[PDB]
Amino acid sequence: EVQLQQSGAELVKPGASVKLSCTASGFNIKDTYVHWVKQRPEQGLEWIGRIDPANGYTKYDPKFQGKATITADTSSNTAYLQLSSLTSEDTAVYYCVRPLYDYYAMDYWGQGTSVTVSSAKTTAPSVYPLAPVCTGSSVTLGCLVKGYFPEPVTLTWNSGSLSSGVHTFPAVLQSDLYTLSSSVTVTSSTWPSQSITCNVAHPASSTKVDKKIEPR
Amino acid sequence: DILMTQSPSSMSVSLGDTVSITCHASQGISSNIGWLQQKPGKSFMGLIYYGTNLVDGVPSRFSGSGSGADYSLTISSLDSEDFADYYCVQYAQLPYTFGGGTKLEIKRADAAPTVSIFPPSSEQLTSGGASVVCFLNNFYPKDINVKWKIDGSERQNGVLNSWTDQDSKDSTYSMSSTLTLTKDEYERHNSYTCEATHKTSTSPIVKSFNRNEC
Amino acid sequence: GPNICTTRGVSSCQQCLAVSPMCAWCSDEALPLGSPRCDLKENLLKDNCAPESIEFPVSEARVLEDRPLSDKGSGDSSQVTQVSPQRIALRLRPDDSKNFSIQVRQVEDYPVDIYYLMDLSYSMKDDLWSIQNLGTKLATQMRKLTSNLRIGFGAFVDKPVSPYMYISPPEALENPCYDMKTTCLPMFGYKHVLTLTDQVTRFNEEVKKQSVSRNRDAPEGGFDAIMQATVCDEKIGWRNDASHLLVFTTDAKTHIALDGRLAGIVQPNDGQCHVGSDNHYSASTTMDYPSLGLMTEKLSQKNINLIFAVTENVVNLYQNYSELIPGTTVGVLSMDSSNVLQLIVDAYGKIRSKVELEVRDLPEELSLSFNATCLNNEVIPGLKSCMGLKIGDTVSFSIEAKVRGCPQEKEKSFTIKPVGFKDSLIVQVTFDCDCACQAQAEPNSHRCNNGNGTFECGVCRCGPGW
Amino acid sequence: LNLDPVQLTFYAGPNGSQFGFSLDFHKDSHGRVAIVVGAPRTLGPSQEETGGVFLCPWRAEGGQCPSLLFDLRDETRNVGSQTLQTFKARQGLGASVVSWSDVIVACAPWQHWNVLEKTEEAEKTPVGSCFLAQPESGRRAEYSPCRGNTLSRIYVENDFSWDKRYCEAGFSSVVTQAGELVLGAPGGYYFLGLLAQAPVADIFSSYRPGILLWHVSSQSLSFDSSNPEYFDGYWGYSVAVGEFDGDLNTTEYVVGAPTWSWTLGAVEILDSYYQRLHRLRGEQMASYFGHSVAVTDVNGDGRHDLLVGAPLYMESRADRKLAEVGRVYLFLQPRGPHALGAPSLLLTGTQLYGRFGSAIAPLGDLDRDGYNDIAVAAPYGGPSGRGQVLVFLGQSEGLRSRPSQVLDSPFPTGSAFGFSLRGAVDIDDNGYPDLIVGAYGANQVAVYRAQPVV
Ligand SMILES: *[C@@H]1O[C@H](CO)[C@@H](O[C@@H]2O[C@H](CO)[C@@H](O[C@@H]3O[C@H](CO[C@H]4O[C@H](CO)[C@@H](O)[C@H](O)[C@@H]4O)[C@@H](O)[C@H](O[C@H]4O[C@H](CO)[C@@H](O)[C@H](O)[C@@H]4O)[C@@H]3O)[C@H](O)[C@H]2NC(C)=O)[C@H](O)[C@H]1NC(C)=O
Ligand SMILES: *[C@@H]1O[C@H](CO)[C@@H](O[C@@H]2O[C@H](CO)[C@@H](O)[C@H](O)[C@H]2NC(C)=O)[C@H](O)[C@H]1NC(C)=O
Ligand SMILES: *[C@@H]1O[C@H](CO)[C@@H](O)[C@H](O)[C@H]1NC(C)=O
Ligand SMILES: [Ca+2]
Ligand SMILES: [Ca+2]
Ligand SMILES: [Ca+2]
Ligand SMILES: [Ca+2]
Ligand SMILES: [Ca+2]
Ligand SMILES: [Ca+2]
Ligand SMILES: [Cl-]
Ligand SMILES: [Mg+2]
């Protein structure tokens, strides 16, 4: 069965260079063109270029001329995408692609490699409890995680105990650092009746702090 | 380069519907077009190649058609698994170019958001920072506007928004808005408010508190 | 005493002669009952047998035409003689044998045709340059050997058809060298350029206007060209009375019969001339390359001596083809044909260094044997060919004919001819198996069982129907 | 021995079409035998020769046959900033045909192809192409493994390596019992010759109309070479399959290369990865040893033997002279792992230019004595030069050295009677396998029915 297995997420600094890999599984990488595609949430999908691993001949979108270098080693059934003089805007997910039957098509995709270019140092998050202000039948608490790097973090309530009725929002980049928050909802009779704690783990800095929510 | 204008950018539909995504190219591409599918937080799967040809393994409820510069993907009788992103791609010319994408979303009855405001934590304040958080939970549809007011006047700087993907249980969306000020600046004022503007009401849902007061 | 002639107890004059070539028959009336009439001629006369009633044929051989060998092949319109005698009469009685002689001369100053057949694919461009003076230079050297030289020129590349020929873009049809930085001719199969002539500057000047073409695959279409240069007699201009040298120059392998299918051509070569007034081989795109056997047949039929003049890289190849086409010569051609003159002169020498007898229309019941005298009166038995000869040399062969029994037809003739030679010896054979006295036999003779029989040669033979 | 030369059956195609150039027996899903006939000069739509294929139902009286229709239109595809082109004029569709299961494969070895890109091009060349049909369902597919999209300048810059532009894929063809199509392509790799293999199933499932350049991933092609012995060898001029390594799970390929080694000629036996197991060398240059090959067990020991045709072999005759007559070589396969040796038997033609050995057809067991038999064609043989097919019977020691039966062409001079032959199939269900003989020069096919031994 045809599978393209790409290397793991990369985490590099601006101005540096990185080389991604795409390894054929269940087939000979030399059989077809191999393309590279860039994806960003805003800009969407962009074709970088292709290579014919049988002979090494490449094509590129002129936009990527300079930054992107596509190569292949038929020996290790692998194709590479080297990026140079990295920049914030090079932050995106990268996929390798090959056709099924049509020589020119784009049918099979690797799982994708995440790339993040930053100067941010490994910073531990600041965890702040969010108690409401000085009434109804339902109550909502929160937890704010601020200024950490790099991603990701795990967030739970009462150590996975309280699960239903919870919203943890996608982290967002704030001045080279990330910020995330989570909300939880229950009945008035539950809180402050029952102790609710916020469990945040940041493996990168190997920190697992936990803030209990206290009323005002 | 050839421009690929894919429409619509999103659609709210339901299990069983028959829906069509269109793609228009800036010049004839004689069926040299592919259709792709990206499931939430996963990689891509090929659906169609050369205009009308199913990729091996793809169910026949998917069909591709069109010619010249106009093409369509059609999905007959939507299945739960079919709610995802779809993209067209042309390969008539290098460089290959892609459509803007289309997201299929679950349709449901409108629902006003549950707003909640939270003043800065003691800890944060003692560290020198001040973040006012505002949650807008479980609403539909997804289109919503949040406005921050300090002492009655709108504030735009220092605001940080975050949205979740449609929920798996109730098919609603939630949003998180955070206003960050310096401790010093936070104390120059008293009233903090966030207004939620949604189609479920002509009046913005308002929530606020007064510093010091409680 | 008694011999096989008498002991055999024959019944007729004819049966007598057939016993042995030494037997004779007596047709005399006055012969004792007990005395046999089939015995040695000496015994019959010894027994008072009328000399005129003795039947005893003797195998003989007399020359009918015996022109002398020419000293020069110049002059005349070929009243030249190179085989002697030219005709003889041969008489043989049953089972007998007779011997005769033949002289063969490699005559001096014999006319020569040289048709130069040239590969003009692109790698021969330099070659074209270096032979622009060949016509006159060759005339100078050949003048030493002959005073009747004619020369001519033809050229080949390959079948102008895909995939041998480039067929795109359209510009490539008009100029195959377009994607290089030059111009060359559109592809051609074979073209005749200069009919054999004694005006050698015509050769220099035609050659100076020739140019190369270009094609895709290495083997070339030269065998098509050998065939046409061979069977288009009138157009090439070969002369009846002259040595024919066909000089084939190439630096590459060659296409052969059954290769044509790669161009969709399956029609076997018909060995016929297909060069018309436009001087191009018009069946090139519709007829397969010729086989070695067909080439051999036509070359031999038109008395053409084929010379493979090829480069070191394919000399072994052509030497091997040469062994499958007897009479062919191979010489090593330099990469620019700068040595082709001496190659031609040496080939001519080698061609006329051999005499090899050949027999045609030999009756089943005749067998021949040969003793050759080459070099210096040294007899070489069981041999019918001489080698290492020089122009002007003369050789001879002693020949013996042996007849088995007596054939139904009493007169047959056959030919002895050296390979490649115009002249030959015609042997007219007469089988002497009958008796003269038979021509005056007596059917239903009163003497023979009351007319039941026939009286011939002095005895009674049963008549027809008995 | 027992083919009936009195009551023949004749099928006929259009004048000038070369109907009979190739043929095969075809069995429909029900086991009903028909005859598929290639006619590589049949006129197309533009009144231009493109070739065509016919599928002849069996009838004692023969007659005309319906067409097996294939798309005869030139195709163009602008894609990837290139222009892909097929050219079907004079492609010779039906220059080879073969049947396997309920599928028919008909090839057009001279189909041309080109790729344009701005002012550059691949060059318009005969890559050849094969068409596949499943008559009962109407399914169609194509296979053209030498098509490429590399531009001319790249081949020049890379010294013409892996140059498949002049393949003529389909020039010869055969299908393994397991359904792998194997194509001979004598022009492959700048006229060395190559083989291309792919399962029929994968050819159908990977093909779609209009694509023109597509991947058949399970396909396998042979290799280029720098050894001059192979140059212009036309390796793949003929092809066949059989069992020659003693292991019944592998199928071995037999490949004719009639101009191998400066026209000495050769036949090679290979494993399915194109690794060479044996090589038989021609006996005489230009004899076209390898023009045809046949595989059949003739001496009843269960081991496949090999026959090789050299139709231009010149036999030695009186007075140091040579007569082109053609020759067939039989090689008996020895017990267990060992080399095929010298030939076990040489069969030599008698008629000058007759081309004895131009085709060789296994007959199965014609006279039913337990040994398999063959027919050899001499398309210009016979006392009148009109063509002969000669039957030789198998026996414990190989083959009989003298023909048991001779079939003289029933057609006029020039028919090429015997140029194509096929046997070993019982078409009239009488329990004896029969013989079909193509005479493309007369646009006809003759069927000889085997009868009980007299
Ligand atoms: C033109 O024609 C010539 C003559 O036929 C060809 O030359 C022959 O080529 C063959 C194939 O290469 C050679 O065959 C080899 O013979 C060797 C022994 O021969 C010796 O003795 C002869 C006596 O005449 C000498 O000439 C020669 O130099 C040797 O000393 C064997 O040892 C070889 O066996 C090996 O290869 C064969 C396969 O070919 C295997 O079966 C064996 O197991 C082993 O591996 C071989 O058989 C032959 O020697 C050559 N003869 C001559 C006289 O040179 C040319 O090739 C041909 N050229 C062209 C372009 O057509
Ligand atoms: C060729 O030469 C041979 C000798 O090698 C001749 O044969 C001999 O002929 C003489 C004639 O008197 C006999 O006595 C010998 O017995 C023969 N010897 C043999 C048989 O070798 C022969 O005559 C010559 N043939 C021709 C045609 O001249
Ligand atoms: C035949 O041979 C004899 C010698 O045995 C010779 O004298 C005679 O001249 C020869 N016959 C002819 C006609 O040459
Ligand atoms: Ca040269
Ligand atoms: Ca050539
Ligand atoms: Ca096997
Ligand atoms: Ca056997
Ligand atoms: Ca038998
Ligand atoms: Ca039958
Ligand atoms: Cl050239
Ligand atoms: Mg050349």
Q: List alpha helices for C133-199, DSSP H.
A: 134-142, 170-174
User: Chain D: nearest CA to C299, how far in angstroms?
Assistant: 14
Query: How many beta carbons lie within 10 A of that of residue A160, not counting itself?
Result: 9
* D1-454 topology per CATH: Methylamine Dehydrogenase; Chain H (2.130.10)
* Three-state SS sequence of chain A: CCEEEECCCEEECCCCCEEEEEEEECCCHHHCCEEEEEEECCCEEEEEEEEECCCCEEEECHHHCCCEEEEEEHHHCEEEEEECCCCHHHCEEEEEEECCCECCCCCEECCCEEEEECCCCCECCEEEEECCCCCCCEEEEEEEEEEEECCCCEEEECCCCECCCEEECCCEEECCEEEEEEEEEEECCCCCCCCCEEEEEEHHHCEEEEEECCCC
Where residue D96 falls (left for φ over 0; alpha for ψ -120 to 50; beta otherwise) is: beta
* Residue D195 near residue D214, CB atoms below 8 Å: no
User: Chain A: nearest CA to B63, how far in angstroms?
Assistant: 15
Helices C134-142 and C340-351 cross at an angle (nearest 10°) of 40
Between chains, do D312 and C291 touch, taking CB under 8 Å as contact? yes
Chain centroid to CA D15: 23
Give Cβ neighbours of residue D360 (< 8 Å, ≥ 6 apart): D292, D293, D294, D307, D309, D328, D374, D375, D376, D377, D421
Q: Round to whole Å and give the CA distance between B90 and A100.
A: 16
Residue that is written with structure tokens 């259709």 in the block: B35
Angle at C97 between CA C94 and CA C99, to 5 degrees: 155
User: Binding site for Ca(2+): what residues of D are annotated?
Assistant: 243, 245, 247, 250, 252, 297, 299, 301, 303, 305, 365, 367, 369, 371, 373, 426, 428, 430, 432, 434
C411-418 and D398-399 as β-strands: parallel, antiparallel, unpaired? unpaired
Q: Round to whole Å and give the CA distance between D79 and D74.
A: 16
Nearest ligand atom owner, CA of D333:
7
Longest CA–CA separation in chain B, Å? 69
* Residue A116 near residue B197, CB atoms below 8 Å: no
DSSP 3-state of C315: helix
Q: Tell me, what DSSP letter sits at residue D263?
A: H
User: What is the amino acid identity at position C268?
Assistant: P
Give Cβ neighbours of residue D83 (< 8 Å, ≥ 6 apart): D76, D77, D115, D116, D117
User: Binding site: what residues of C are annotated?
Assistant: 121, 123, 126-127, 158, 215, 217, 219-220, 251, 335
* Residue B43 near residue B127, CB atoms below 8 Å: no
The chain D residue lying nearest C322, using CA atoms, is D285
Angle at D103 between CA D100 and CA D109, to 5 degrees: 85
Q: Round to whole Å and give the CA distance between A63 and B155.
A: 38
Chain centroid to CA A163: 24
* Residue A44 near residue A57, CB atoms below 8 Å: no
B161 Cβ under 8 Å from any chain A Cβ: yes
* Residue D351 near residue D358, CB atoms below 8 Å: no
Q: Is A114 exposed, middle or buried (0-12, 13-18, 19+ CB in 10 A)?
A: middle
Return the half-sphere exposure (C-beta side, CA atoms, 13 A cut-off) of residue A16.
Answer: 13
Q: Tell me which of D262, D268, D279, D340 to substitute to probe ligand 1's pocket, judged by most ligand atoms within 8 Å of the beta carbon.
A: D262
Give Cβ neighbours of residue C150 (< 8 Å, ≥ 6 apart): C111, C112, C113, C114, C196, C197, C198, C237, C239, C242
Instruction: Say yes or no: do domains B1-107 and B108-211 share a fold.
Output: yes
Q: Round to whole Å and give the CA distance between C160 and C187.
A: 6
Q: Which structural domains are found in chain C, ordered by start?
A: 1-57 (3.30.1680.10), 58-106+356-466 (2.60.40.1510), 107-355 (3.40.50.410)
Question: Does the Cβ of C398 fall within 6 Å of ligand 2?
Answer: yes
Q: Which of D146, D353, D355, D413 to mutate to test the interface with C (most CBs of C within 10 A)?
A: D353
Give Cβ neighbours of residue C181 (< 8 Å, ≥ 6 apart): none
Q: Tell me, what DSSP letter sits at residue D43?
A: B
Q: Which long-range contacts (CB under 8 A, 24 or more apart) does B7-11 make?
A: B7/B102, B8/B102, B9/B100, B9/B101, B9/B102, B9/B103, B10/B102, B10/B103, B10/B104, B10/B105, B11/B102, B11/B103, B11/B104, B11/B105
D152 Cβ under 8 Å from any chain A Cβ: no
Which tokens belong to C59?
A: 């195998």
D252-257 and D238-242 as β-strands: parallel, antiparallel, unpaired? antiparallel
Which tokens belong to D352?
A: 């000058």
Give Cβ neighbours of residue C391 (< 8 Å, ≥ 6 apart): C106, C107, C108, C145, C349, C352
Least Cα distance to C118 among C229, C244, C238 occurs for C229
Angle at A34 between CA A33 and CA A38, to 5 degrees: 140
**How does D170-200 read in b/e, with b if 16+ C-beta sit within 10 Å?**
bbbbbbbeeebbbbbbbbbbbbbbbbbbbbb
- A:D CB pairs within 8 Å: 27
Q: Tell me, what DSSP letter sits at residue B55?
A: P
* Closest atom, ligand 1, to C-alpha of D264: 61
DSSP 3-state of D381: coil
Torsion angle of alpha carbons C372, C373, C378, C381, nearest 10°?
10
D139-143 and A3-6 as β-strands: parallel, antiparallel, unpaired? unpaired
Residue that is written with structure tokens 């030494």 in the block: C22
End-to-end CA distance of chain D: 9
| Total residue length of chain A | 216
Least Cα distance to A102 among B68, D197, D105, B51 occurs for B51
Domain at B1-107: CATH architecture:
Sandwich (2.60)
Dihedral sign computed on CA atoms, order D264, D270, D275, D280: negative
Q: Tell me the CATH number for domain B108-211.
A: 2.60.40.10
* Residue D374 near residue D360, CB atoms below 8 Å: yes
Least Cα distance to C311 among C227, C243, C244, C254 occurs for C254
Question: What residues of C are in contact with residue D231 (Cβ under 8 Å)?
Answer: 218
Q: Which residues pair with D378 in a beta bridge?
A: D388
Angle at C293 between CA C292 and CA C297, to 5 degrees: 115
Q: Round to whole Å and give the CA distance between A68 and A63.
A: 9
Which tokens belong to B212?
A: 């010091």
Write out the H or E segment, with its range, that includes residue C225. helix C222-231
* Residue D268 near residue D334, CB atoms below 8 Å: no
D160 Cβ under 8 Å from any chain C Cβ: no
CA distances, D389 to each of D328, D423, D440 (Å): 13, 12, 15
B31 Cβ under 8 Å from any chain D Cβ: yes
User: Chain A: nearest CA to D213, how far in angstroms?
Assistant: 6
**How does C382-402 read in b/e, with b if 16+ C-beta sit within 10 Å?**
eebbbeebebebbbbbebebe
Q: Tell me which of C59, C96, C99, C103 to substitute to probe ligand 3's pocket, judged by most ligand atoms within 8 Å of the beta carbon.
A: C99
Angle at D311 between CA D309 and CA D316, to 5 degrees: 110
Which tokens belong to D278?
A: 């044996």
Residue that is written with structure tokens 């030399």 in the block: A30
Q: Is A135 exposed, middle or buried (0-12, 13-18, 19+ CB in 10 A)?
A: exposed
Residue that is written with structure tokens 């792998």 in the block: D180
User: Chain C: nearest CA to D233, how far in angstroms?
Assistant: 10
Residue that is written with structure tokens 């009989």 in the block: D400
B55 Cβ under 8 Å from any chain D Cβ: no
Q: Which structural domains are found in chain A, ordered by start?
A: 1-119 (2.60.40.10), 120-213 (2.60.40.10)
> Does a cis peptide bond (omega within 30 degrees of 0) precede residue C407?
no
B13 Cβ under 8 Å from any chain D Cβ: no
Which tokens belong to A187?
A: 């009945």
Q: Round to whole Å and give the CA distance between C172 and C184.
A: 10
Question: What residues of A are in contact with residue D214 (Cβ under 8 Å)?
Answer: 101-103
Q: Round to whole Å and give the CA distance between C291 and D333.
A: 32
* Residue D371 near residue D396, CB atoms below 8 Å: yes
Domain ranges of chain D: 1-454
Between chains, do B131 and A128 touch, taking CB under 8 Å as contact? yes
Give 3-state DSSP helix, strand, coil % of chain D, rounded to 5: 5, 40, 55
Give Cβ neighbours of residue D163 (< 8 Å, ≥ 6 apart): D155, D189, D190, D224
* Residue C460 near residue C445, CB atoms below 8 Å: yes
Q: Round to whole Å and give the CA distance between D315 and D324.
A: 6
B121 Cβ under 8 Å from any chain A Cβ: yes
Q: Round to whole Å and give the CA distance between C106 and B211.
A: 135
CA of C317 from ligand 1 middle (Å) equals 14
Least Cα distance to D245 among D371, D340, D373, D342 occurs for D340
Least Cα distance to D95 among D48, D129, D66 occurs for D129
Return the half-sphere exposure (C-beta side, CA atoms, 13 A cut-off) of residue A3.
Answer: 6
Angle at D235 between CA D234 and CA D236, to 5 degrees: 100
Q: Round to whole Å and give the CA distance between B119 and A130.
A: 8
Chain centroid to CA C404: 27
Angle at C104 between CA C100 and CA C105, to 5 degrees: 155
Chains D and C touch (3+ CB pairs under 8 A): yes
Helices C134-142 and C201-209 cross at an angle (nearest 10°) of 150
* Residue D299 near residue D305, CB atoms below 8 Å: yes
Between chains, do B93 and D80 touch, taking CB under 8 Å as contact? yes
Least Cα distance to C219 among C256, C260, C255 occurs for C255
Q: Round to whole Å and give the CA distance between C439 and C253.
A: 69
Domain ranges of chain B: 1-107, 108-211
